[PDB]
Amino acid sequence: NLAALRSELQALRREGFSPERLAALESRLQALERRLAALRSRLQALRG
Amino acid sequence: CLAALRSELQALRREGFSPEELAALESELQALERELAALRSELQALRG
Taking the C-alpha atoms of residue B48 and residue B35, their distance in angstroms, rounded to an integer, is 20
Which chain A residue has the Cα nearest residue B41?
Answer: A5
How far, rounded to the nearest angstrom, does the alpha carbon of residue B9 sit from its chain's CA centroid? 9
Cβ proximity of B42 and A25 under 8 Å: yes
The interface residues of chain A toward chain B in range 8-27, judged by CB-CB distance below 8 A, are 8-9, 12, 17-18, 21-22, 25
Helix (H, G, I), strand (E, B) or coil at A16: coil
Contact state of B29 with A22 under an 8 Å Cβ cutoff? no
Q: Which residues contact A21 (CB under 8 A, 6 or more apart)?
A: B46
Q: Number of structural domains, chain B? A: 1
Resolution rounded to one decimal, in angstroms? 1.5
What DSSP line would sit under chain B, residue for residue? -HHHHHHHHHHHHHTT--HHHHHHHHHHHHHHHHHHHHHHHHHHHHH-
Which chain B residue has the Cα nearest residue A32?
Answer: B32
Q: Which domain holds residue A39?
A: 1-48
What method did the depositors use to determine the structure? X-ray
Helix (H, G, I), strand (E, B) or coil at A35: helix
